[PDB]
Design an enzyme around this catalytic site. Structure first.
Site, PDB file in Angstrom:
ATOM      1  N   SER A 137       0.897  -1.105  -0.042  1.00 48.68           N
ATOM      2  CA  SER A 137      -0.128   0.030   0.040  1.00 48.68           C
ATOM      3  C   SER A 137       0.719   1.065  -0.091  1.00 48.68           C
ATOM      4  O   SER A 137       2.030   1.057   0.238  1.00 48.68           O
ATOM      5  CB  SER A 137      -0.962  -0.051   1.090  1.00 48.68           C
ATOM      6  OG  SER A 137      -0.185  -0.302   2.522  1.00 48.68           O
TER       7      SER A 137
ATOM      8  N   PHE B  55      -5.894  -6.589   9.542  1.00 47.54           N
ATOM      9  CA  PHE B  55      -6.046  -6.912   8.015  1.00 47.54           C
ATOM     10  C   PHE B  55      -4.552  -7.160   7.479  1.00 47.54           C
ATOM     11  O   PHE B  55      -4.430  -7.778   6.312  1.00 47.54           O
ATOM     12  CB  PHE B  55      -6.362  -5.789   7.207  1.00 47.54           C
ATOM     13  CG  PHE B  55      -7.763  -5.400   7.374  1.00 47.54           C
ATOM     14  CD1 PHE B  55      -8.822  -6.253   6.547  1.00 47.54           C
ATOM     15  CD2 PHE B  55      -8.255  -4.232   8.078  1.00 47.54           C
ATOM     16  CE1 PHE B  55     -10.153  -5.902   7.142  1.00 47.54           C
ATOM     17  CE2 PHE B  55      -9.411  -4.109   8.231  1.00 47.54           C
ATOM     18  CZ  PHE B  55     -10.329  -4.689   7.822  1.00 47.54           C
TER      19      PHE B  55
ATOM     20  N   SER C 200     -10.669 -16.002   6.154  1.00 44.34           N
ATOM     21  CA  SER C 200     -10.870 -16.070   4.724  1.00 44.34           C
ATOM     22  C   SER C 200     -11.595 -17.430   4.665  1.00 44.34           C
ATOM     23  O   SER C 200     -11.479 -18.403   5.488  1.00 44.34           O
ATOM     24  CB  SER C 200      -9.470 -16.429   3.939  1.00 44.34           C
ATOM     25  OG  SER C 200      -9.698 -17.052   3.025  1.00 44.34           O
TER      26      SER C 200
ATOM     27  N   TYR D  66      -1.178 -20.148   1.550  1.00 43.32           N
ATOM     28  CA  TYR D  66      -1.950 -18.887   2.135  1.00 43.32           C
ATOM     29  C   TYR D  66      -3.230 -19.519   3.041  1.00 43.32           C
ATOM     30  O   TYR D  66      -3.469 -18.742   4.113  1.00 43.32           O
ATOM     31  CB  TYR D  66      -2.245 -18.043   0.968  1.00 43.32           C
ATOM     32  CG  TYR D  66      -3.371 -17.243   1.339  1.00 43.32           C
ATOM     33  CD1 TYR D  66      -4.738 -17.463   1.087  1.00 43.32           C
ATOM     34  CD2 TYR D  66      -3.355 -15.918   2.128  1.00 43.32           C
ATOM     35  CE1 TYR D  66      -5.825 -16.704   1.945  1.00 43.32           C
ATOM     36  CE2 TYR D  66      -4.188 -15.179   2.578  1.00 43.32           C
ATOM     37  CZ  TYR D  66      -5.462 -15.333   2.417  1.00 43.32           C
ATOM     38  OH  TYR D  66      -6.403 -14.650   2.765  1.00 43.32           O
TER      39      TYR D  66
ATOM     40  N   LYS E 148      -4.004 -19.263   7.040  1.00 39.17           N
ATOM     41  CA  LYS E 148      -5.093 -18.567   7.578  1.00 39.17           C
ATOM     42  C   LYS E 148      -5.936 -19.513   8.755  1.00 39.17           C
ATOM     43  O   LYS E 148      -6.347 -18.985  10.035  1.00 39.17           O
ATOM     44  CB  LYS E 148      -6.279 -17.969   6.475  1.00 39.17           C
ATOM     45  CG  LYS E 148      -5.851 -16.910   5.642  1.00 39.17           C
ATOM     46  CD  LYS E 148      -5.214 -15.791   6.469  1.00 39.17           C
ATOM     47  CE  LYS E 148      -6.388 -14.689   6.956  1.00 39.17           C
ATOM     48  NZ  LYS E 148      -5.967 -13.385   7.090  1.00 39.17           N
TER      49      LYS E 148
HETATM   50  N1  LIG Z   1      -8.248  -9.304  -0.884  1.00 36.28           N
HETATM   51  C1  LIG Z   1      -8.684 -10.532  -0.625  1.00 36.28           C
HETATM   52  O1  LIG Z   1      -8.987 -11.230  -2.138  1.00 36.28           O
HETATM   53  C2  LIG Z   1      -8.798 -11.157   0.404  1.00 36.28           C
HETATM   54  C3  LIG Z   1      -9.834 -12.243   0.594  1.00 36.28           C
HETATM   55  C4  LIG Z   1      -9.626 -13.051   1.950  1.00 36.28           C
HETATM   56  C5  LIG Z   1      -8.973 -12.549   3.204  1.00 36.28           C
HETATM   57  N2  LIG Z   1      -8.270 -11.220   2.791  1.00 36.28           N
HETATM   58  C6  LIG Z   1      -7.472 -10.727   4.042  1.00 36.28           C
HETATM   59  O2  LIG Z   1      -7.586  -9.346   4.107  1.00 36.28           O
HETATM   60  C7  LIG Z   1      -6.315  -8.831   4.504  1.00 36.28           C
HETATM   61  C8  LIG Z   1      -5.582  -7.930   3.890  1.00 36.28           C
HETATM   62  O3  LIG Z   1      -6.409  -7.989   2.480  1.00 36.28           O
HETATM   63  P1  LIG Z   1      -6.373  -6.897   1.693  1.00 36.28           P
HETATM   64  O4  LIG Z   1      -7.116  -7.246   0.461  1.00 36.28           O
HETATM   65  O5  LIG Z   1      -6.805  -5.474   1.986  1.00 36.28           O
HETATM   66  O6  LIG Z   1      -4.721  -6.854   1.360  1.00 36.28           O
HETATM   67  P2  LIG Z   1      -3.875  -5.694   0.918  1.00 36.28           P
HETATM   68  O7  LIG Z   1      -2.280  -6.092   0.778  1.00 36.28           O
HETATM   69  O8  LIG Z   1      -4.450  -4.586   0.063  1.00 36.28           O
HETATM   70  O9  LIG Z   1      -3.688  -5.046   2.684  1.00 36.28           O
HETATM   71  C9  LIG Z   1      -2.800  -5.592   3.355  1.00 36.28           C
HETATM   72  C10 LIG Z   1      -2.058  -4.516   4.253  1.00 36.28           C
HETATM   73  O10 LIG Z   1      -0.963  -5.075   5.063  1.00 36.28           O
HETATM   74  C11 LIG Z   1      -0.052  -4.503   5.046  1.00 36.28           C
HETATM   75  N3  LIG Z   1       0.967  -5.429   5.455  1.00 36.28           N
HETATM   76  C12 LIG Z   1       1.302  -6.736   5.019  1.00 36.28           C
HETATM   77  N4  LIG Z   1       2.392  -7.489   5.658  1.00 36.28           N
HETATM   78  C13 LIG Z   1       2.293  -6.326   6.754  1.00 36.28           C
HETATM   79  C14 LIG Z   1       3.101  -6.691   8.228  1.00 36.28           C
HETATM   80  N5  LIG Z   1       3.819  -7.748   8.398  1.00 36.28           N
HETATM   81  N6  LIG Z   1       2.841  -5.701   8.946  1.00 36.28           N
HETATM   82  C15 LIG Z   1       2.139  -4.500   8.593  1.00 36.28           C
HETATM   83  N7  LIG Z   1       1.305  -4.429   7.602  1.00 36.28           N
HETATM   84  C16 LIG Z   1       1.592  -5.508   6.710  1.00 36.28           C
HETATM   85  C17 LIG Z   1       0.232  -4.192   3.525  1.00 36.28           C
HETATM   86  O11 LIG Z   1       1.406  -3.240   3.291  1.00 36.28           O
HETATM   87  C18 LIG Z   1      -1.233  -3.572   3.214  1.00 36.28           C
HETATM   88  O12 LIG Z   1      -1.277  -2.261   3.139  1.00 36.28           O
HETATM   89  C19 LIG Z   1      -5.338 -10.161   4.913  1.00 36.28           C
HETATM   90  O13 LIG Z   1      -5.723 -10.611   6.261  1.00 36.28           O
HETATM   91  C20 LIG Z   1      -5.781 -10.941   4.004  1.00 36.28           C
HETATM   92  O14 LIG Z   1      -5.803 -12.518   4.375  1.00 36.28           O
HETATM   93  C21 LIG Z   1      -8.257 -10.671   1.746  1.00 36.28           C
HETATM   94  C1  LIG Z   2      -6.856 -17.667  -7.413  1.00 36.26           C
HETATM   95  C2  LIG Z   2      -6.805 -16.828  -6.345  1.00 36.26           C
HETATM   96  O1  LIG Z   2      -6.702 -15.558  -6.294  1.00 36.26           O
HETATM   97  N1  LIG Z   2      -7.518 -17.414  -4.994  1.00 36.26           N
HETATM   98  C3  LIG Z   2      -8.235 -16.329  -4.132  1.00 36.26           C
HETATM   99  C4  LIG Z   2      -9.916 -16.592  -4.024  1.00 36.26           C
HETATM  100  O2  LIG Z   2     -10.121 -17.750  -5.037  1.00 36.26           O
HETATM  101  P1  LIG Z   2     -11.151 -17.685  -6.047  1.00 36.26           P
HETATM  102  O3  LIG Z   2     -11.141 -18.620  -7.168  1.00 36.26           O
HETATM  103  O4  LIG Z   2     -12.548 -17.555  -5.195  1.00 36.26           O
HETATM  104  O5  LIG Z   2     -11.386 -16.258  -6.973  1.00 36.26           O
HETATM  105  P2  LIG Z   2     -10.515 -15.780  -8.316  1.00 36.26           P
HETATM  106  O6  LIG Z   2     -10.734 -14.194  -8.365  1.00 36.26           O
HETATM  107  O7  LIG Z   2      -9.090 -16.237  -8.145  1.00 36.26           O
HETATM  108  O8  LIG Z   2     -11.141 -16.374  -9.232  1.00 36.26           O
HETATM  109  C5  LIG Z   2     -12.653 -16.530  -9.626  1.00 36.26           C
HETATM  110  C6  LIG Z   2     -12.959 -17.419 -10.480  1.00 36.26           C
HETATM  111  O9  LIG Z   2     -12.524 -16.806 -11.886  1.00 36.26           O
HETATM  112  C7  LIG Z   2     -11.567 -17.539 -12.405  1.00 36.26           C
HETATM  113  N2  LIG Z   2     -10.643 -16.742 -12.780  1.00 36.26           N
HETATM  114  C8  LIG Z   2      -9.863 -15.805 -11.986  1.00 36.26           C
HETATM  115  C9  LIG Z   2      -8.674 -15.058 -12.342  1.00 36.26           C
HETATM  116  C10 LIG Z   2      -8.427 -14.909 -13.742  1.00 36.26           C
HETATM  117  O10 LIG Z   2      -7.393 -14.331 -14.314  1.00 36.26           O
HETATM  118  N3  LIG Z   2      -9.122 -15.921 -14.687  1.00 36.26           N
HETATM  119  C11 LIG Z   2     -10.110 -16.939 -14.206  1.00 36.26           C
HETATM  120  O11 LIG Z   2     -10.711 -17.572 -14.821  1.00 36.26           O
HETATM  121  C12 LIG Z   2     -11.403 -18.870 -11.512  1.00 36.26           C
HETATM  122  O12 LIG Z   2     -11.454 -20.099 -12.124  1.00 36.26           O
HETATM  123  C13 LIG Z   2     -12.353 -18.796 -10.398  1.00 36.26           C
HETATM  124  O13 LIG Z   2     -13.303 -19.947 -10.859  1.00 36.26           O
HETATM  125  O14 LIG Z   2     -10.386 -16.736  -2.786  1.00 36.26           O
HETATM  126  C14 LIG Z   2      -9.579 -16.171  -1.411  1.00 36.26           C
HETATM  127  C15 LIG Z   2     -10.968 -15.178  -0.837  1.00 36.26           C
HETATM  128  O15 LIG Z   2     -10.847 -15.825   0.750  1.00 36.26           O
HETATM  129  C16 LIG Z   2      -8.572 -15.284  -1.814  1.00 36.26           C
HETATM  130  O16 LIG Z   2      -7.789 -14.759  -0.693  1.00 36.26           O
HETATM  131  C17 LIG Z   2      -7.495 -16.164  -2.873  1.00 36.26           C
HETATM  132  O17 LIG Z   2      -6.303 -15.354  -2.761  1.00 36.26           O
END
Ligand SMILES: NC(=O)c1ccc[n+]([C@@H]2O[C@H](COP(=O)([O-])OP(=O)(O)OC[C@H]3O[C@@H](n4cnc5c(N)ncnc54)[C@H](O)[C@@H]3O)[C@@H](O)[C@H]2O)c1
Ligand SMILES: CC(=O)N[C@H]1[C@@H](OP(=O)(O)OP(=O)(O)OC[C@H]2O[C@@H](n3ccc(=O)[nH]c3=O)[C@H](O)[C@@H]2O)O[C@H](CO)[C@@H](O)[C@@H]1O
Ligand SMILES: NC(=O)c1ccc[n+]([C@@H]2O[C@H](COP(=O)([O-])OP(=O)(O)OC[C@H]3O[C@@H](n4cnc5c(N)ncnc54)[C@H](O)[C@@H]3O)[C@@H](O)[C@H]2O)c1
Ligand SMILES: CC(=O)N[C@H]1[C@@H](OP(=O)(O)OP(=O)(O)OC[C@H]2O[C@@H](n3ccc(=O)[nH]c3=O)[C@H](O)[C@@H]2O)O[C@H](CO)[C@@H](O)[C@@H]1O
Ligand code: NA
Ligand code: NA
Ligand code: NA
Ligand code: NA
EC number: 5.1.3.2
Lengths: 338, 338
Positions: free
Chosen positions: A36, A80, A124, A149, A153
């Protein structure tokens, strides 16, 4: 309340901070800026209509955590901070375990020392692994996630759970969610992936903006209505909202509170693409590829419990998720300024 | 070879070091003395017939680990360092996760940096959790362990596994075992529990020596031949031996090598008690209690794979385990001197 928001300058955290401030809480952001930029800060304040204190630093630094905790008299922590790129987790498992597992451990160790007992863990839904029946319900046992990953979690969820058992006065929320998308309505905050975008939405957006040529669609032969993978997408604003409610309502309420945060329905890859074509005013280019690595046909979360218990449910549509995304992309094509 | 033995001054490690030295390897012991005393060192050297270099310090200190690794040009690491008291794990989960999960992570992070790629993890058969079919076989998926102790062990197994996947040149052994008992034949080394002994054997020994009044036997109604719990006990010397063979034979052989270390049979609580009465020349006092907490009727490990693959199998009997224990107890009633 006085909330320490680890990872607050990130995607979901930044949106969560705005909502916190709007509710009038006192926000302390702790982020290492690994994913970020400082440039988000002022946008945060502005949209939030209030000043969030910012601390550059790492969750792994227990000493610093404790300091912060005391210095700011924190009531609750929304966590987060961490790493979340699935394929990167397979290549660099150690970093993922260090940042996520040890990173949270250091963080809660510090809370203990500082006597902070309210915690909101950004979990997650990957934790359910292959332990279905779908949609997933909080009453379902978790399964075994496939990437480092996913595993990190669940490991953290387990640690927190045991911790809570040993220190029963702690309030801990495990917020499980799937695919956060969209962006603040202002168009001034949104997801800013640095390299090749992880998630579908942004990947699509980049294709749409011309940055990418064609979206590879993995598997057009799943046992779904349109043959593509069915997933669960949740507008980041609804997610932010979930976080705040969870934080306000569970503070000082002892136990481990598990809640799926989702729309409670799934959408296929084509549904997302078509929603986006419609948003950006032009056909997103894509082609089909064969079924991907760790991917299943269809899954989504059952979000009944948060509705019943927190009176929370999503309010945004898939179409808004697309629009809001296109909106941010279109207003800040270069993302956050350096 | 040049082996760094973390936790080397402890119970199993001390015995393992003697065997290492007898084989003529160059041994570097790394221990924090949280559960062992310096007084063991000289006994080690003596019985080992060689000098083991000793380093007081912690696995969590990554910097120090790296230093050691380089300073001694280490080839392989046998990792016994950690906390292993089940009920204490429930009360102080954080410490267990820090010491075991983060402790190993720090340790392998350092190996990476120091370019060490041979590792022998002292695992635990608690990893099979309730994922049976008994006896347990390495081909059985693990289950979910019940204490933070069990969970920390499986978590570490998982981390190592992923690490190995990402860094395929690494050789990693996951040595799973149950109940280590007995003592060196000399009678000059053995298990030295500080407080109320965890394991049956020592607990029994203390009763026998008069330190304890009666052994509580939990559950005399299990579906076993005599109604008491059936477990798997393995003489610590056989275990030590397993560790050496595993270390010699797997060095530079890439992959994750999983092996159950056990006698391949179970013995009930009464069988152990009776073996001990016979050893110490007098009836051990005991009474029955109701079925304990996290306890099952009967389990033991299938040790066919190590036999076939490492040509390893136990050579000591339950009776020797008892005798050897009584022997050490009887020669050093006060354990290791301060
Ligand atoms: N975005 C997704 O698809 C996804 C789905 C499931 C869970 N999450 C969870 O949400 C959280 C972050 O999600 P996000 O999408 O906002 O990601 P993001 O990378 O945009 O936000 C994470 C932030 O944490 C900071 N960070 C990473 N490691 C750190 C550390 N050791 N100390 C301090 N800051 C640190 C990064 O600089 C960043 O600003 C995590 O817990 C991630 O597992 C996100
Ligand atoms: C692959 C991936 O990122 N896994 C993430 C996600 O899986 P998740 O599969 O749910 O999400 P994705 O964005 O990766 O893909 C969604 C769907 O679109 C498809 N797809 C995606 C990207 C692309 O370029 N092309 C395409 O076809 C995949 O087959 C899937 O069926 O769930 C979590 C939410 O808790 C995230 O934190 C994981 O990091
Ligand atoms: N004894 C058992 O019943 C049991 C069965 C299964 C697994 N194990 C495993 O064997 C290992 C130790 O077993 P043990 O019976 O010899 O126990 P032990 O306590 O006698 O040996 C452990 C040694 O590690 C040291 N130690 C602990 N934390 C440390 C740290 N952070 N840094 C450095 N040294 C540290 C202690 O001082 C001690 O000398 C652990 O991996 C344990 O999980 C033992
Ligand atoms: C309880 C316990 O220590 N759990 C340990 C052990 O379980 P495990 O149950 O196998 O071993 P224990 O020594 O604890 O007990 C063996 C048997 O004797 C009984 N018993 C034991 C002690 C006593 O005072 N009275 C009595 O009746 C129990 O019912 C059990 O049936 O397996 C792991 C080996 O990988 C260890 O690292 C765990 O720390
Ligand atoms: Na307790
Ligand atoms: Na940019
Ligand atoms: Na790789
Ligand atoms: Na003593």
């Amino acid at each position: 309340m006085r909330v320490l928001v680890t990872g607050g300058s990130g995607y979901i955290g930044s949106h969560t901070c705005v909502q916190l401030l709007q509710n009038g809480h006192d926000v302390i952001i702790l982020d290492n800026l690994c994913n970020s930029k400082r440039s988000v800060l002022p946008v945060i304040e502005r949209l939030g209509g209030k000043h969030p204190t910012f601390v550059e630093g790492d969750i792994r630094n227990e000493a610093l955590m404790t300091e912060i905790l005391h210095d700011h008299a924190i009531d609750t922590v929304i966590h987060f901070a961490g790493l979340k790129a699935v394929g990167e987790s397979v290549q660099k498992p150690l970093e993922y375990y260090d940042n996520n597992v040890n990173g949270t451990l250091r963080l809660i160790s510090a809370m203990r020392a500082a006597n902070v007992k309210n915690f909101i863990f950004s979990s997650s839904a990957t934790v359910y692994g292959d332990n279905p029946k779908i949609p997933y319900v909080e009453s379902f046992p978790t399964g075994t996630p496939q990437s480092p990953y996913g595993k990190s979690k669940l490991m953290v969820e387990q640690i927190l759970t045991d911790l809570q058992k040993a220190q029963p006065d702690w309030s801990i929320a495990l917020l499980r969610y799937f695919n956060p998308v969209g962006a603040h309505p202002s168009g001034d905050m949104g997801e800013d992936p640095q390299g090749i975008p992880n998630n579908l939405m942004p990947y699509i957006a980049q294709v749409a903006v011309g940055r990418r040529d064609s979206l590879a669609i993995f598997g057009n032969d799943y046992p779904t209505e349109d043959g593509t993978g069915v997933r669960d997408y949740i507008h980041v604003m609804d997610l932010a909202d979930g976080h705040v409610v969870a934080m306000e309502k569970l503070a000082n309420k002892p136990g481990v509170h598990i809640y799926n945060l989702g729309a409670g329905v799934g959408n296929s890859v084509l549904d997302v693409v078509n929603a986006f074509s419609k948003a950006c005013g032009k056909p997103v280019n894509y082609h089909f590829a064969p079924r991907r690595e760790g991917d299943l046909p269809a899954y989504w979360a059952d979000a009944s419990k948060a509705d019943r218990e927190l009176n929370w449910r999503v309010t945004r549509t898939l179409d808004e998720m697309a629009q809001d995304t296109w909106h941010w992309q279109s207003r800040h094509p270069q993302g956050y300024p350096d």
